[PDB]
């Protein structure tokens, strides 16, 4: 979270987190939400909009990231660790 705080969310304009709470394989994505929805990272720019769209219907967990440019980052965190997702996100932001 501190690493993401240092590396501000300048290029990204929108982030969306979708998960099924009853599903056993969502905890990672939930952790990701916990990291991305903090003041330390959110107060870098108010251009970013964090949306949490939690659903009950059986579906694969996934997070969506919209950049200012043509960059588009979707990743399914069903079998992805939170730390791995954060590192990948940071690398994509670096561009």
């Amino acid at each position: 979270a501190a690493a993401l705080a240092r590396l501000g969310l300048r290029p990204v304009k929108q982030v969306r987190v979708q998960f099924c709470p009853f599903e056993k394989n969502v905890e990672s994505t939930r952790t990701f939400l916990q990291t991305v929805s903090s003041e330390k990272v959110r107060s870098t720019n108010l251009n970013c909009s964090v949306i949490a769209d939690v659903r009950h219907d059986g579906s694969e967990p996934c997070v969506d990231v919209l950049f200012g440019d043509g960059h588009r980052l979707i990743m399914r965190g069903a079998h992805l660790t939170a730390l791995e997702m954060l590192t990948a996100f940071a690398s994509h932001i670096r561009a």
Binding site: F22, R55, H56, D57, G58
Partner: protein, 46 residues
């Protein structure tokens, strides 16, 4: 015993067996029995 509710979003509204038995009893019962049931229901609430 657990509720085990909300099996699926698209589930066609599955019902417990307990809620089903009273429905069958009302249908089998005659109108005279239903008439007293309706009057008592009206007395309780309107």
């Amino acid at each position: 015993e657990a509720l085990a509710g909300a099996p699926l979003d698209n589930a066609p509204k599955e019902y417990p067996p307990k809620i089903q038995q009273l429905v069958q009893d009302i249908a089998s019962l005659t109108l005279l029995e239903i008439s007293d049931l309706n009057e008592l229901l009206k007395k309780t609430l309107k």
